[PDB]
């Protein structure tokens, strides 16, 4: 069924909450035993958001290999993503260790450091060229190279140095700065423009490690970003683009991380973004 008609049907009948609860009921349940170990309690932002054991990213250290992060591997679309929580004061060094070890080119951030008057993640990158950051627990140095501030997003060039080997790499930071404190955006236009800027940089392409994408918990806004990207790519690749089923793609993604898409409003917004984005993919 052409999702544009499915959309109008759900909208006229006002059944978004019913559709969304069906997804919640059918979603995979896999163990998350490592996340729940007592030694990892201060590595998790939220008690009810954890990576599954089978898909979690492991840090390359013998001490404690745990980070709240998951590998989402989309086989037909030939895309992979790492979805993670916003870093905590005690996990900023782990976060950049993961970026280094997984050979990522881009980091996608979908929240502000403060929202609703409370801290949603640590200030984990430097704000001034001449004030670099050193993460002593993981032996990394991070420098701000340049910053381009636009009306709806900011893009930063960063240098990450492995102090053990003195290798350096360029990381791109894509920061969507205008998601509202409550609800979802009224139009998907600026979010789609942002997605296309990430694509254009190479950060989603197979010559690099998976992009790292986060919000506060790494499931809601972050889920919307990867769901929209994968659905638009499948519409490009297939003979019959109307065969792409957004609910089926979301359930596939939920085999790899729990809770992706947090509200019925985020589900509607995901449909809207794919419908409006397709009017470029197809040929317009």
UniProtKB/Swiss-Prot annotation:
One of its GO terms (biological process) is peptidyl-tyrosine dephosphorylation. One of its GO terms (molecular function) is zinc ion binding. Oxidized on Cys-215; the Cys-SOH formed in response to redox signaling reacts with the alpha-amido of the following residue to form a sulfenamide cross-link, triggering a conformational change that inhibits substrate binding and activity. The active site can be restored by reduction. Ser-50 is the major site of phosphorylation as compared to Ser-242 and Ser-243. Activated by phosphorylation at Ser-50. It is found in: Endoplasmic reticulum membrane. Keywords: Acetylation, Endoplasmic reticulum, Hydrolase, Membrane, Oxidation, Phosphoprotein, Protein phosphatase, S-nitrosylation. The modification Cysteine persulfide is found at residue 215. There is a cross-link at residues 215-216 (N,N-(cysteine-1,S-diyl)serine (Cys-Ser)). The modification S-nitrosocysteine is found at residue 215. Residues 3-277 form the Tyrosine-protein phosphatase domain. Expressed in keratinocytes (at protein level). It catalyses: O-phospho-L-tyrosyl-[protein] + H2O = L-tyrosyl-[protein] + phosphate. The modification Phosphotyrosine is found at residues 20, 66. It is a peripheral membrane protein. The active site is at 215 (phosphocysteine intermediate). The keyword Transmembrane does not apply. The modification Phosphoserine is found at residues 50, 242-243. The modification N-acetylmethionine is found at residue 1. The modification Cysteine sulfenic acid (-SOH) is found at residue 215. Its EC number is 3.1.3.48. Tyrosine-protein phosphatase which acts as a regulator of endoplasmic reticulum unfolded protein response. Mediates dephosphorylation of EIF2AK3/PERK; inactivating the protein kinase activity of EIF2AK3/PERK. May play an important role in CKII- and p60c-src-induced signal transduction cascades. May regulate the EFNA5-EPHA3 signaling pathway which modulates cell reorganization and cell-cell repulsion. May also regulate the hepatocyte growth factor receptor signaling pathway through dephosphorylation of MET. Belongs to the protein-tyrosine phosphatase family. Non-receptor class 1 subfamily. Interacts with EPHA3 (phosphorylated); dephosphorylates EPHA3 and may regulate its trafficking and function. Interacts with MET. Interacts with NCK1. This is Tyrosine-protein phosphatase non-receptor type 1. The lineage of its organism: Eukaryota, Metazoa, Chordata, Craniata, Vertebrata. The chain holds residues 1 to 284 of 435 of the full protein.
């Amino acid at each position: 069924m052409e999702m544009e008609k499915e959309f109008e049907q759900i909208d006229k009948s006002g059944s978004w909450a019913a559709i969304y609860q069906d997804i919640r009921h059918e979603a995979s349940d896999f163990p998350s035993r490592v996340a729940k170990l007592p030694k990892n309690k201060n590595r998790n932002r939220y008690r009810d958001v954890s990576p599954f054991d089978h898909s979690r990213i492991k840090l390359h250290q013998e001490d404690n290999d745990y980070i709240n992060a998951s590998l989402i591997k989309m086989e037909e679309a030939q895309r992979s993503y790492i979805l993670t929580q916003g870093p905590l004061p005690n996990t900023v060094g782990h976060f950049w260790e993961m970026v280094w070890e997984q050979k990522s080119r881009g980091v996608v951030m979908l929240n502000r450091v403060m929202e609703k008057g409370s801290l949603k993640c640590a200030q984990y990158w430097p704000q001034k060229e001449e004030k670099e950051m050193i993460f002593e627990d993981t032996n990394l140095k991070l420098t701000l190279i340049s910053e381009d501030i636009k009306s709806y997003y900011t893009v930063r060039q960063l240098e990450l140095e492995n102090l053990t080997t003195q290798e350096t790499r360029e990381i791109l930071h894509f920061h969507y700065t205008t998601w509202p404190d409550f609800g979802v955006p009224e139009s998907p236009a600026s979010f789609l423009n942002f997605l296309f800027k990430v694509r254009e940089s190479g950060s989603l392409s197979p010559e690099h490690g998976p992009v790292v994408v986060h919000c506060s918990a790494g499931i809601g806004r972050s889920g919307t970003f990867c769901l929209a990207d994968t659905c638009l790519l499948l519409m490009d690749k297939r003979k019959d683009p109307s065969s792409v089923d957004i609910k089926k793609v979301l359930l596939e993604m939920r085999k790899f991380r729990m809770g992706l898409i947090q509200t019925a409003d985020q589900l509607r917004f995901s449909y809207l973004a794919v419908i409006e984005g397709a009017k470029f993919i197809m040929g317009d």
